[PDB]
Structure formats: structure tokens, C-alpha cells
Amino acid sequence: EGMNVKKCCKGFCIDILKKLSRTVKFTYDLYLVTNGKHGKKVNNVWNGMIGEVVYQRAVMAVGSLTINEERSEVVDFSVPFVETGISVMVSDQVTGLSDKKFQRPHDYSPPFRFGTVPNGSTERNIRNNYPYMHQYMTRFNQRGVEDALVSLKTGKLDAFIYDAAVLNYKAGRDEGCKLVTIGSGYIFASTGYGIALQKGSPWKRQIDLALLQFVGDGEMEELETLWLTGIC
């Protein structure tokens, strides 16, 4: 039995879909179904919202995830409204990902819990870039985002590699400003958040025009001040 309760939520994607329905003036059928996580071409296993938007007949999805290879070859994402990329946020002397402590973890930086969320875009990007780093993150895979935040607030987690936007959102509510983002997310991956659209859909042009009008009218600073509330 599946409880189809009509619960209301607020957030970033909620405001995005609200302004989309207010400007483009279209009707949508939003539903939050319990699914898996970000899917990729690993043994052709497609789960979560990514696996749903991979197939056709799906109009769109408010979830704007990081740009990848398969998620760009299967469907055509819209224009990236954000420029935040994949970076590392160690919970000082390191220089990001170009430090020599990652290529040779035997002498310096002994192998610790450096894994990301299971079945994530960062895992695929690292496997495409660094096989040994991907194997290390796999053998040291951590728990979900909430457990990662708990470990960061505790001090046992050494570094947390994710998108710069997620790191800024986490740092905006730190309990004393302990963890600091060592290096912004523009020298490692430089990705963005694109709306999951349908391959060859007539609404793609409308969504692109709506995004270019929303980030081309002078309210980008207002959005940055409203959403990003980083005080430290």
C-alpha cells in the first residue's frame, strides 16, 4: 500500500517550478515518489529520478543535477543557471585536488574515509579521471549526506568532495565555522545545474528562454541573497 498523501513543501525547486508556471503559464503534475539515487551507465542500471528522466515521454524534472556524460548524451539539459562545480572541502595546507598527497597516500595523507554518496556523479567523474582515487573512495564509501554532515560537525570525516553549491549551503549553517572550502569549484570540474528535459522536446526552447529571462533581468543578486544565507 502506497500512501498518496498531499503534502506541501517549499524550497529551491518549489520556487523554480512556481516561477516557471507563473511565467510560462503551463500546467504540471508534481509527485514525489520514493526512488533510489543518481543513475548512470553502470551495467545499464537506471534508478532514481535520473533513471526516470532518461527514458522519453517524461516532460521535465525540477531536479537540476550536475552535468555529466551520459546525462547529456541521453537527454538535452537546459542552460546551466549556476556555475558551481565539483570541489573539495576539507574539515588548510592542502591546495585542493592538485596536492601530491592524493597520488601517493602511503607517506602523507593515509587512506581515510574519502568516499562520496553511493552512485553519485562524483564517483563517475573520478573513475573517468582517476581510477585509483575512485577505488579508494569505493573501499572507503561513507553514508548519506546527513551522516556526512554529522561526521563533519564531529571531526572524524577528513574531507567531503561534492559540488560547490552543496558545500556553500552546508557552510551557510555551520556550528562555529570549523570546516572551510579550500579552493572554489571552478578549477576541478566547472559543472552546472541543468534542468532534466526530454530529448527533442518542444518545451526545451521555452524552458531555456525562461531561464535566460530569469537570470537576465537583474534579479540574480536578489536570488543569491535570498537563497545563499552564508553568514560565516
Binding site: 546551466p80 556555475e83 567523474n125 578549477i187 576541478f188 570540474a189 559543472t191 540574480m220 543578486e221
Partner: protein, 80 residues
């Protein structure tokens, strides 16, 4: 740039990377830290070009790997 570097005008509004490179090269020019209009500037393409998606996919594949970032760090990031 020649005007603002020789004490002729007040300030200059331009791209963030260009002003950062000018500040790293020219010590007299020190740009502010407040950054706004954070948007990825795309490459202008034709309206009915047949390879409109091919060049975009190529740029995406080149940016996914660690080549474009290294080239940018070695060329644009001239720190003295």
C-alpha cells in the same frame, strides 16, 4: 584598461576572469571581491547549424576530463 591603469577614470566593469588577470599582472589595479552575475557564458552558434549539438558535446567531453582546467590554470592563471 589603459585609462584606468594611468589614473584617468574611476573604475571599470568587465569580465571577472579578465579583471582578475589584470589585477594579477598589474599591481596598481586591485579589483573588488564582490562577484555578481555568475552565469556560464556559452559559445554563440548558428540558428540552423547541423552540428549545433556536436560542438557542445565535444566541449562537454573536454571539460569533463582534466585538460581544459589544466590549460586554464596554466594560461589564464598568471600569478606573479
Amino acid at each position: 584598461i589603459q585609462a584606468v591603469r594611468d589614473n584617468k577614470l574611476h573604475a571599470f566593469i568587465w569580465d571577472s576572469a579578465v579583471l582578475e588577470f589584470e589585477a594579477s599582472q598589474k599591481c596598481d589595479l586591485v579589483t573588488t571581491g564582490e562577484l555578481f552575475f555568475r552565469s556560464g557564458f556559452g559559445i554563440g552558434m548558428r540558428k540552423d547549424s547541423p552540428w549545433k549539438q556536436n560542438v557542445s558535446l565535444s566541449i562537454l567531453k573536454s571539460h569533463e576530463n582534466g585538460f581544459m582546467e589544466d590549460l586554464d590554470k596554466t594560461w589564464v592563471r598568471y600569478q606573479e
